[model samples]
Target chain A: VRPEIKQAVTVRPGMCGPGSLFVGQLGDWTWETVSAQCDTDVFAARDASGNPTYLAFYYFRVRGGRELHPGSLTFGDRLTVTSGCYDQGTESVLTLHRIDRAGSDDAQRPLDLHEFYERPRDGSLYVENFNRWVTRSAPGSNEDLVKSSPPGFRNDGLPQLPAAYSPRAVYREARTAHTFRALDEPGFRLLPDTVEVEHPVDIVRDVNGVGLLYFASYFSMVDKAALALWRRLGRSDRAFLRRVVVDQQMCYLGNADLDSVLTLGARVRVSTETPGEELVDVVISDRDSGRVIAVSTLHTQHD
Target chain B: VRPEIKQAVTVRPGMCGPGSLFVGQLGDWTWETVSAQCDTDVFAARDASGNPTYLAFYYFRVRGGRELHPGSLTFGDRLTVTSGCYDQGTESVLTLHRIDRAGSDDAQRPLDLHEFYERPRDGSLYVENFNRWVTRSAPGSNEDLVKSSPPGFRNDGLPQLPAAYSPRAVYREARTAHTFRALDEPGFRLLPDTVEVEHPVDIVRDVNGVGLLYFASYFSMVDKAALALWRRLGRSDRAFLRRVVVDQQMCYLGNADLDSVLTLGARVRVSTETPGEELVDVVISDRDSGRVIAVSTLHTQHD
Candidate 1:
């Protein structure tokens, strides 16, 4: 069956992946800036009641070696996308693939879709099979490739992928389990040293979609608390000024809304190691309810 | 010595301490959103060589209890600032303080500038002393007061502060030493589970000063890497879906220019804990010189 079609959406300048570079092309030349931009129609099938029986997920990868020179006005040399779905009732799977030149190359390849969504029938075979299929079907020499996930869908349960898709050759070193402590956990105590700061949520700058604060913004808040703590400490040792944050993590328990009060408290603890390090434990809570919004720990060291 | 006078600069929206609310106000009103906005001339003593021997630093605090209602078009309730300086040659300290209203109060207080900036003789005494001085001097009822630091100057060492200003009561818990490790050290390894992404540096969106990436933007990059690593792991389990970043820290080494190539490599390491948490180590190196730009570690957990 032919792929479903969706309405076209315009690409804007300063629009790059979350951490990707800004394509700063001055003039609004279509191909020079964003070769093309559009969204596809939802591919999930619906039952007799018009309720979706399956959910569809989409992803893209762009090569790094593709000479993404935004100043000279070239971006996104090539783009690849996979649209897949798993049935809610039967849990069956289907995936579709498409490759296209961002700016040039008028010829678009024929639609080559697959079923079962490559869920990895066996260990370590899925990536091999998946990679082989993509490479064989759409040949290219692009090396600086990046897989892009929909910023809106990242936290949603749509792009359902099994562990088999994770390449063991690459992920073997990453296998580990961790335990997290909550803000109210008895094991963790709120340090006496804390700073209360008030902040308002911006409609664009602070959100992921609508009401939710983007997960990344939490780090920014903790960093601010660290700065305030440093000021309170009022230490001038080179070790303190030349400090670098080595590690930090946060647990998101709830969301912050526009104009809601966020009380951030950061407490500093010293490491036992020689040439000591400072560990900052921070908790953001709703002042009205005293409910924890997020908890985090930051490890910092002198350079 | 009289502080040096500099030209006044206008404050803009979207400019606030990290995670702090924007001071948005209109209609030439004051003492509400931003009570006032002005920059004094730099105050420094001329050296024997006809150069400024001492550099000045500025700081501010807003009341926490003040009704800083920005939604109905109101902002900061109150503001306090210290225009101080230290000797360039010796880095010895002096600090001065002033409290001002942003609107309606027309009586501009005489500039009571001082020299040999107040350096706390005893630990923690300075903040107490300074706070008391500002409080007694301003004598306002604003409760929602906050300490405001220049957003652009936070990392540049511009708000140069001496330790003598900090009060011991609040800072005692934070006193500690710290040591940092290099990316090439034995402790860190370039894992095979890496994703390379290309991004353009936006002039406004991604930068702090001209040509330099904002310190906070690095965290944003690492967060993006974590997103990529999450996909590569291809773990569709509900646990992965409910994942929240519990901690993250980044170090600033080199700087990234407007059009420079940044090769961001994120390696994922899972914990040994039963619930399974992911630790992502990220390194952003200059592709041209192979020099390390920044390194960070992010800890995330499933809720």
Candidate 2:
């Protein structure tokens, strides 16, 4: 069980006296944000026999209240999650597949799932460098705090949570965090296939009007910033949102309490260079000490 | 089978032989929007026996795909709905109650369910002047289209939903729509008693980056507007989001397809004048043709 997983997957007695089990007290902040944007239903998964079966959470890996890096679990692995419908009893094994993948027919599938791979899922589910740490037990791993009973627990006491978000991929996606503007360079040969814009922060206050941006408000603003970049190319009504990876910088998270007029710089890369889709990125940073706030890698199906 | 309840309440075959009734095809636009902001778990309902019970949708009344007015059903009534768990069987009766009320202790409850009541729950679920119309069967009403077969159904028919969010609660809460600034007038003798701010629409386009403004973006702006008002008075870290009812004006929805720089005018009513809590109102409108885009009544628990 992890602290970020607001609720853990546990078995509950069924309405029937026996032979019934339900996934109880389930709440995953990561799933909720991804659920709304996924093209496939969040619960839908494939079985070993190639049939589409619904899935339930029996395990999770999250850090600091957000989903950990997609690299935590490998795609195509079988996780011992429960079956969504606990009629006869919950199934104990389910195959996990990456949302962004090619079908057996060699056609690309709908790449709308904003998570579940070795990449940032979407603007809403931004996987910042600060969000890379994990607290839960890995699949089939004997590394959980309670199971290990590490030296700290001499008297079988409750396992305490780590003070800060750490202990995993330290800088999972920090490579591009403070990177300067690049799309308009010789990158794509690239002016004709690129677009850029600058946006000023409107309400530089958190949920409580404390004159600072909360971590959650980053999603809407990130989403809107990407939308602005997408508009620079042209509105593609048939567009499919393929990616929305927003990677926040450590420098930025440390300054979460300041009231500064942040500016967002957004730019786009075309499908011609990227092959199947267009790629856009957004960066919002303060003017001085914390020059790098967050970077968003945006994408969509372009004609 | 209301057009608004995107996914209707239907039963699915259980893995076991019989007595298994799982809620299949469950999608309610209104609930998804309301689920995030609710204080009490949205699925938690009171049972007729006075114990806590979980509820699943058996029916709904929605117009233009959003939740209809709170006036649609009275509180304390029993609706024959399905129990969330279907191990033995789904329960048929559940008690419905309003979110806002004195507790069994006659003390003020958390007051956070944000929806399922009259007077616009919160900005996110703002039951604006335009959001009142519905297209579903009311409780115990014999007015469903197929049951009685209206004049439009000469043959076996698929009832078509009415045109563009109308035919119910015409001009609901419209009295508050387009009302000139009231807080600043002689009303409260209110200069020191109130606060105000003006925000310009940054990106006037919709999700697709179209030239027009989509109706959905009004929310973050509205929430931000309210937060701005709250900051002008002072930030209350212990604040509880009691309300966020954003009421879109017919004039606003109509011009949703146009890209015009709309202005947001926000004002607040003191806890002294309104008593108990402060009431903040936000109006976003175009300078020219469409005068009133929407009105949001904002409030929060005051110390």
Candidate 3:
């Protein structure tokens, strides 16, 4: 079977404020420019999720100043994280793709055969051969974003899937007659998902540890453990990728000090009977000081 | 008398990033796009302060999409809070003028006699006849900003100082040499300063109140209570607005709820002998819940 051909999602200036030339890589923001309308609310989308993701990764592909999706992996309808059978020995990498339709899709190629691996120590999931990835994005406003970084699984093939590239959660090759599940099986779930991380405080040394607070908030709900797993398919009768909406409520309990360590816990349950709705509950706390920095439950909907 | 003319401060695109179109207003930002470099740390410049003010107002003056100093007030050397003596009985209104030299100054007019008044309750000091303010800025790079806001003090006099406008920090009466020292005064300070404000939650209702967190952080140290005083001058032997550098440390102990109330307190102790150094200690907390949210000590320097 041929690999599923995925389209590239382009990031544009319109995604930000009008004529905003936002182009950059992945790192803690050292400087910020807030709109008179917006304070520093990264997850300020009230009506829906992801439509206006205020905090995002952008690269202007004008061939002059902006680079296309640098430090980014893919441009997709939903941020997809392939569980490359790495992080948790189960499918767990959570990719941050586009969940908004305001920007158009670009690129005439399939996903590059990049190897995915989740680092257990820092709870970071990344791709291998990051430098070889092509850029993705249009030049100006309402444009496209094309883009990369570290290494992980070996993808010597460059853009082809190896046997266990995207491993399966339900293992075993034995032919099943034992209460087998097929044709809309009652979903699956991965649990006891957890991560340990340190807040990126050095990047923006704000006195109140706010930079870390916001980062942890987003991280809590999008960790490998927060992956929504149910009816994943190899042969989809449908040619289109399903859309997802996101929303969450978070409570900050204490300060995450510089030396503070963070531990994240997540659990998700979903099924074909209710393929439309899925939820991930995440709890992030400071392990070093025993401070429960924040707890959040993220709502993910596939429409 | 010749009016004190101010040079225009041009705001260029470089002030943002290599290529960033961060141009726009005085409202709470509804949409925000953060960089991998920075987060929602508005008042994040920690070392000497003001130099790397993360959160700032910018305008591109290019006839194209960038408008110079849009909705901004001036292109001064330091972010000055002109007490215009309208807020409180004495000079109490606070203006957020520049305190950094990373960007140069521009403009060719005296301090426009914008009517200045300090509202009693909301604790806001504003220039009346805001729309009349002109736009200022260079075409696109590290440039100047010319700017506006609501009505308060009427400046029918336009660019001339209307007496009792920038009123004295100290009170009036007949002058006498009785035990009065003039060679170098003890420098003056405004007292009984206080401000009651509601968090700008409506602008950004972030789940954990982080928006209010960073805003209140900046506000606590720059309010009327935070104004620096001492040197009173009609004619500066030196023709220059003394340069000021800013720095502060903040601690957040509680969340600023939507309906939460805030109160501020400030005190400063500096004299002509220590004219080069000054500091304003600020404390901001939630009144409704009787919570002591944050306490900050701001360090200010006029060189």
> For candidate 1, lDDT tens digit of each residue in A90-132?
2212232222324334323332222122321211101011110
- Provide the lDDT at B119 for model 2: 34
Off by over 4 Å in 2: A1-187, A192-216, A223-255, A271-276, B1-173, B176-187, B192-219, B223-255, B267-278, B299-303
lDDT per residue (tens digit) for residues B1-303 in model 3: 212212222222212211111222111111121111122222122112222222222110111101212112221112222211112211012122211123334221123234122221112112211111212233221212232211222222223334554322111110121111222245644244334434432211121111122332233233323432222222131121222323333333333543344565555544445565544455555666676554444344544
Q: Which ten residues in a row have the lowest lDDT in candidate 2 chain A?
A: A15-24
By DockQ, the best candidate is 2
Record all residue pairs in model 2 with backbone atoms less than 3 Å apart, i.e. clashing: A114-A121, A122-A244, A123-A244, B122-B244, B122-B245, B123-B244, B123-B245, B126-B245, B126-B246, B128-B247
Query: What overall lDDT goes with each candidate model?
Result: 0.34, 0.30, 0.27
All candidates in order of lDDT, best leading:
1, 2, 3
Error of 2 at B101 (Å): 12
Residue A268 CA displacement from its true place in model 1, Å: 1.9
Give the CA lDDT, 0 to 100, for residue A94 in model 2: 16
Off by over 4 Å in 3: A1-188, A191-195, A200-259, A265-270, A274-277, B1-303
Winner of 1 and 2 under TM-score: 2
- lDDT tens digits, residue span A5-114, model 2: 12212111111110111101112222232222222222223333333232222222221111322221221112222111101112221112222211223213222222
Please provide, for model 2 over B1-303, each residue's C-alpha lDDT reduced to its tens digit, 9 standing for 90 to 100.
111111211111111110111101111222232222222222223333333232222221221112322121221211222111101112221112222211223212222222323333321122221121112233322122111111111111212223343323333443244332244444333324333344444432232111223233454455566666666666652242323222222222333223345667766655555444454566666665555656655433344
Candidate DockQ values, in order, are 0.01, 0.06, 0.02
lDDT score of residue B47 within candidate 1: 32
RMSD in angstroms between candidate 1 and the native structure over all alpha carbons: 24.8
